[PDB]
Amino acid sequence: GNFKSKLKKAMLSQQITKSTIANKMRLKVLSAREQSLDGIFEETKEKLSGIANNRDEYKPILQSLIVEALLKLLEPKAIVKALERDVDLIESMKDDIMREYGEKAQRAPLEEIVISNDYLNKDLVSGGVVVSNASDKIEINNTLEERLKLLSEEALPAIRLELYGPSKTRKFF
Amino acid sequence: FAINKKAVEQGFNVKPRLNYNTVSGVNGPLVILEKVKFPRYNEIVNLTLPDGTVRQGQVLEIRGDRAIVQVFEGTSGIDVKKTTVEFTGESLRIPVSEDMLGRIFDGSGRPIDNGPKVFAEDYLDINGSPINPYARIYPEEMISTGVSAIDTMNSIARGQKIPIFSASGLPHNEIAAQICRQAGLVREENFSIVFAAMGVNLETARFFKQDFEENGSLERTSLFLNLANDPTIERIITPRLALTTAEYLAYQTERHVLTILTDMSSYADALREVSAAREEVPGRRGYPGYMYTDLSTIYERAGRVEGRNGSITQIPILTMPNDDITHPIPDLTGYITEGQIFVDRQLHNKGIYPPINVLPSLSRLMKSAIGEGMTRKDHGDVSNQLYAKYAIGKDAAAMKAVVGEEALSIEDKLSLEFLEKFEKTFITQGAYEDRTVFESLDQAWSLLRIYPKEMLNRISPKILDEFYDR
Amino acid sequence: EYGAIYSVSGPVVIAENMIGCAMYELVKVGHDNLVGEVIRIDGDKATIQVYEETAGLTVGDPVLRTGKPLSVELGPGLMETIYDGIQRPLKAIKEESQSIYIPRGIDTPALDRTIKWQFTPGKFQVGDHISGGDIYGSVFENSLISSHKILLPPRSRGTITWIAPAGEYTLDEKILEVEFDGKKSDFTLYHTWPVRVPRPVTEKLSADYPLLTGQRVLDALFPCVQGGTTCIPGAFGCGKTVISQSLSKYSNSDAIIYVGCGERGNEMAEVLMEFPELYTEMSGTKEPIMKRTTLVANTSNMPVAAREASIYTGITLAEYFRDQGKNVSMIADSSSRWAEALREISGRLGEMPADQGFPAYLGAKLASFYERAGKAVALGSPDRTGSVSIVAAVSPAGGDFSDPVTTATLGITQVFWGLDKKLAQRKHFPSINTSVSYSKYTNVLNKFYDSNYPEFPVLRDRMKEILSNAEELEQVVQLVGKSALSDSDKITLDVATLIKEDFLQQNGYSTYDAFCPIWKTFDMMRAFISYHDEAQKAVANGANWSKLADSTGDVKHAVSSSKFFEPSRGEKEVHGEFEKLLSTMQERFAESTD
Amino acid sequence: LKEFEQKNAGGVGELEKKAEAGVQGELAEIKKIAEKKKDDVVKILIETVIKPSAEVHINA
Structure with missing residues (x-):
């Protein structure tokens, strides 16, 4: 009977080993998939960094981003912090910012805009802006890298459906 | 393809989120914000303590421009000058996919098996929505658990919700392991398992893991583990995640799920814990009034539906505090669920395994389960006669112990012998001793033959004529 | 705005x-x-x-x-359908959405607005004077209900100026115009009514007609009158579903409105697909029951608030059907859930509680709700008559009978059917505690009984005293034993066990044991009492009951098996069978005792 | 018992190589499909992230 128990536990051990092997193989496959997806994400960062080195295209993009931040914020005053290259056009087209604000935020046109003497870790960012109210207590981190990272959590189903075909098992979407 | 794609095209909808810095109050497990712009009831926020750690939480109340955020992982160490709250803008949701099988998740559903993040197919709100009764079908097929005490007098149908009452210090874990190991149908093996344990000791978790390893079933199941050391508030989340995954699998992949919760007592305790944190009206024994509704929400995800071939089955495990049925937890659980299987002490004290009594056990779906196309007609009458004779034997034993052996009529001694043989042979079975319904019932017939034929009342004459003789 | x-x-x-x-x-x-x-x-x-x-x-x-x-929209089409707690059809929602959940914020008309009805005008003509509650035509609805009377809504009166002719109409048509001071009145096939305001009625009355239930014990010892109220406590294991289903099925009511306030839900599907094939012969024959019901389903999973309005909707619909002159009989499923919802709302609102956390007005609310039941005479010219008989089913928390809700209900209701737990555990399925359960319509029903069965009342008390004496002797025999027992006491105990095993057991699955007419139970209990009386007479004349019982033998088996007679065989063939059994039993006692 | 242990002791490498060869085609197929449909996804992501969307909370 003891020998029977010993052979039983030997069978248990070998079955455990083979199950572990199968689990490890599956984990390896999933890790490879995830690594490939992360590599795909990687390219977008460098593409955005390259795009961020052309003033003609960059200007409308930055203007639109700051306009979106202001529209969501909905405050009479605001503070924006980044490299201050475009204070002239910004605060002059801030007439256009007021105009579009009254077009959409028809309650009134924006009161003013203030550029902080602080800047960003441009080694860690590739443009964009951070917008905060006058009291400097409500912020909308809206840089390019931040936007890409944020989008990297909602496109996963779409990314899957695009890279691969629809899950043949799924029957009701 | 296009139909599926149109349901996902809205993914590319980046939306910036604003993070405040006006935390203006804290006490107990609650945090109070101020000057928040257009709150949204029951959404998710991500705090960031001054040391960089981030905890999660959801708003529970919305006054005029101020939300009472509730934190999961305690509140100690929260600063008022440096903390930064952030809003996701949407309710709590989790990723899902058929690849979750064979993976282990913590209480919050993040992987803990060294694997990568789930390559999600889509996100789903944890809370779910009710099912209109008109789109519901009650089951009519019997599962064969191999346990005679169950598969004889308390059958299980694919779609039922049968809790297993229990008391601390009894082998309910072994019973659950045996059931999952012998979950075959009367007659592939699509029985995925979504075991989700909350508030349990380490040894129980490791034992369950090893049991799943040995049977070559881990690759067919997913684990939601939440040990005691984890925060209490987070406890009330795990069962909802488990049920969400189970229903996704069973209603969008045509699988046959089999979920086995455990220690609902700990879940109720967590409800009491963060219910007395606030000052809501107490029910009985300090329990919340709306625990009945909450437990109904948890339990009422079961049965089959109109179109989907998939099914689902719940086997939650309870832990009666002091071996009292009249405790509110078992009271409400019985009020909701459809019959239950019980466990006693003395039987366990008598070395009888599985220590299952049957007198207080009940199962409603037996009527639809038993019949002709699945079993012999005798099935129901045999069980009824066993109940009657067992009860008579119990009462006769009590009376004999009271007075003596002089007043015990011949029938009384026959009942005592029947009770002894029943509890000593019919119930006892090994840790790996299967019993299909046919052989179990055949063995059961042996015990009744001790009785003279005529006295048998609750059994129709045809069954006696066609079966008793053999 | x-x-x-x-x-x-x-x-x-x-x-x-x-x-x-x-x-x-x-x-x-x-x-x-x-x-x-x-x-x-x-x-x-x-x-x-x-x-x-x-x-x-x-x-x-x-x-x-x-x-x-x-308010709830009445009119034709209400019946044979299933509604949620706030009067929303359920099949239509599922079909339109093609989903399995309930889409929040979805809206549909209460009644189908597409089908057409074969309308027929009533008996009023232009220039006549009418008042609220008068019928102005019938409508064909179903083979089981040929005439679906349409009514002038209360609080609306005048003289009819134009009426529609016979034909086929949809319930959007304006088929009647009433000329009050102004001509601002139009009336289609349907109307509405605020739920919280009970419908008016000419006057109440006294109910004196039994509500047959098909259950032996219920009909024998605790009769329920057609027009009263009852209560059925439990302990979540007593299986009260059995009696609810049996009375919803085989009762003699014209219509029934099953309402589910906080139920397991699966029972709704059970009844949904179970009823459609179970025929009744009240009118014509073979008509399936599902053409005789309306279901107001609200599972415990669905929002808490709707559990409040569900019962109001059910009772209002019952009152509407009663107003047509049909003896409807509503039945609830769980009143305790309603009290729990009220307590939760009160507590969240932040108000001082009352006994066991519940609010203070729950007793008044329960009394007001129960008061709506009762036989009455309709309000109108035809002078039709109807009745309502609600049957609640409370569910305590600890399984005892001291929680506030049950105490409040018992002060209102007038029939009490308590359910024990141990008897249910013993599979004695109609497990009713015959010790505490009581009725109150006993005396009034004598007017019916003397006309139909003069001897029944004395016999029920005979059995009641027999059972009481058996229960009084059980503890003494347990604490001492049969050593100090006389023959008569043993006879009493044996007959008590015989009754408990034969006249009190039932099972709604055997064909013969699914519905027991009044005559069958009358004859069976008559035979039981006669058997006991003959045994007592013989033992008094002198004989060892231990010797006598073995000789008596087969007659005991015959009386035990009497229940196996097929009900509805001839209604008189069974009467002759009972007569013959009684005669042969009497002869046996005449000779076997000798 | 020792013979039984040795029987499957040497087979550990056998099963290792068996499974290893069992999963090689899928591993390279993943790389191939990733190469095939890479640029378009990057273009879509860039277009989405770069594209703004004027909005305001509707209740305002």
Whole structure:
């Protein structure tokens, strides 16, 4: 009977080993998939960094981003912090910012805009802006890298459906 | 393809989120914000303590421009000058996919098996929505658990919700392991398992893991583990995640799920814990009034539906505090669920395994389960006669112990012998001793033959004529 | 015009800029127009209880008004369908959405607006004078209900100026115009009514006709009159579902309105697919039962608030059917759930509690709800008569009978059917505690009994005293034994066990043991009493009961098996069989005792 | 018993190589499909992230 128990536990051990092997193989496959997806994400960062080195295209993009931040914020005053290259056009087209604000935020046109003497870790960012109210207590981190990272959590189903075909098992979407 | 794609095209909808810095109050497990712009009831926020750690939480109340955020992982160490709250803008949701099988998740559903993040197919709100009764079908097929005490007098149908009452210090874990190991149908093996344990000791978790390893079933199941050391508030989340995954699998992949919760007592305790944190009206024994509704929400995800071939089955495990049925937890659980299987002490004290009594056990779906196309007609009458004779034997034993052996009529001694043989042979079975319904019932017939034929009342004459003789 | 949300707490919502709002006025809230019900008013703000899930609501959402209270749409088509707690058809929702869940904020008409009805005019002609509650034509609805009377809504009166002719119409047509001071009146096949206001009635009456249930013990010892109320406590294991289903099935009511307030839900599917093939022969024959019912389902999973309005809707529909002159019989499923919902709402609202946390007005609410039941004479010219008989089923928490809700109910109801747990555990399925359970319509029913069965009342008391004496001797025999027992006591105990095993056991699965007419039970209990009386007479004349019983033998088996007679065989063939059995039993006692 | 242990002791490498060869085609197929449909996804992501969307909270 003891020998029977010993052979039983030997069978248990070998079955455990083979199950572990199968689990490890599956984990390896999933890790490879995830690594490939992360590599795909990687390219977008460098593409955005390259795009961020052309003033003609960059200007409308930055203007639109700051306009979106202001529209969501909905405050009479605001503070924006980044490299201050475009204070002239910004605060002059801030007439256009007021105009579009009254077009959409028809309650009134924006009161003013203030550029902080602080800047960003441009080694860690590739443009964009951070917008905060006058009291400097409500912020909308809206840089390019931040936007890409944020989008990297909602496109996963779409990314899957695009890279691969629809899950043949799924029957009701 | 296009139909599926149109349901996902809205993914590319980046939306910036604003993070405040006006935390203006804290006490107990609650945090109070101020000057928040257009709150949204029951959404998710991500705090960031001054040391960089981030905890999660959801708003529970919305006054005029101020939300009472509730934190999961305690509140100690929260600063008022440096903390930064952030809003996701949407309710709590989790990723899902058929690849979750064979993976282990913590209480919050993040992987803990060294694997990568789930390559999600889509996100789903944890809370779910009710099912209109008109789109519901009650089951009519019997599962064969191999346990005679169950598969004889308390059958299980694919779609039922049968809790297993229990008391601390009894082998309910072994019973659950045996059931999952012998979950075959009367007659592939699509029985995925979504075991989700909350508030349990380490040894129980490791034992369950090893049991799943040995049977070559881990690759067919997913684990939601939440040990005691984890925060209490987070406890009330795990069962909802488990049920969400189970229903996704069973209603969008045509699988046959089999979920086995455990220690609902700990879940109720967590409800009491963060219910007395606030000052809501107490029910009985300090329990919340709306625990009945909450437990109904948890339990009422079961049965089959109109179109989907998939099914689902719940086997939650309870832990009666002091071996009292009249405790509110078992009271409400019985009020909701459809019959239950019980466990006693003395039987366990008598070395009888599985220590299952049957007198207080009940199962409603037996009527639809038993019949002709699945079993012999005798099935129901045999069980009824066993109940009657067992009860008579119990009462006769009590009376004999009271007075003596002089007043015990011949029938009384026959009942005592029947009770002894029943509890000593019919119930006892090994840790790996299967019993299909046919052989179990055949063995059961042996015990009744001790009785003279005529006295048998609750059994129709045809069954006696066609079966008793053999 | 509009209002903005100001604060949210689960099911309670507080709005602002709400000035013209009244109390209990219906309102729609949210961008999906969720239904609510204003409760308390404080300046601009007014508390609202929401009748659906409140997740993701945001401050600043517009709030609307309707200016009218909660109401339910009556008329043809109500019947044979299934509705949720707030009068929404369920099959239509599933079909339209092609889903399995309930989409929040979905709206559909209460009654189908497409089908057409073969209408027939009544007996009134232009220029006549009419008042609220008078019929002005019938409508064909079903083979089981050929005539679906249409009515002039109460509080509406005048003289008819134009009427429609016979033909086929949809319930949107204006088939009648009433000329009051002005001609501002039009009436289609349907109308509405506020639920919280009981429908008027000419006058109440005294109910003196038994409500047959098909259950032996219920019909024998605790009869229920057609027009009264009852209560059925339990301990979540007593299996009270059996009697509810049996009385909903085989009772002699013209219509029944099953309502589920906080149920397991699966039972709704059970009844849904079980009824469609179970025929009744009250009119003609073979008509399936499902053409005789209306289901108001609200599973415990669905929002808490709707559990409140569900029972009001059910009772209002029952009153409407009663007004046609048909003896409807509503039956609830769980009143305790309603009390739990009320307690939860009260506690969340932040108000001082009462006994065991419940509010203080629950007793008054329960009394007012129960008062609506009762036989009465309709309001109108034809002078038809109807009746309602509600059957609640309370469910205590600890399984005892001391919780506030049960105590409040027992002070209102007049029939008490308590359910024990141990008897159910013994599979003695109609497990009714015959010690505490009591009835009150016993004396009044004598008017029916003497006409139909003069001897029944004395015999029921005979059995009652027999059972009481057996229960009085059980403890003494247990504490001492049969050593100090006389023959008569042993006879009493044996007959008590015989009754408990034969006249009190039933099973709604055997063909013969599914429905016991009055005559069958009458004859069976007659035979039981005669057997006991003959045994007592013989033993008094002198004989060892131990010797006598063995000789008696087969007659005991015959009386035990008497219940196996097929019901509805001839109704007189069975009478002759009972007569012959009694005669042979008497002869046996004449000789076997000798 | 020792013979039984040795029987499957040497087979550990056998099963290792068996499974290893069992999963090689899928591993390279993943790389191939990733190469095939890479640029388009990057273009879509860039277009989405770069594209703004004027909006305002509706209740305002």
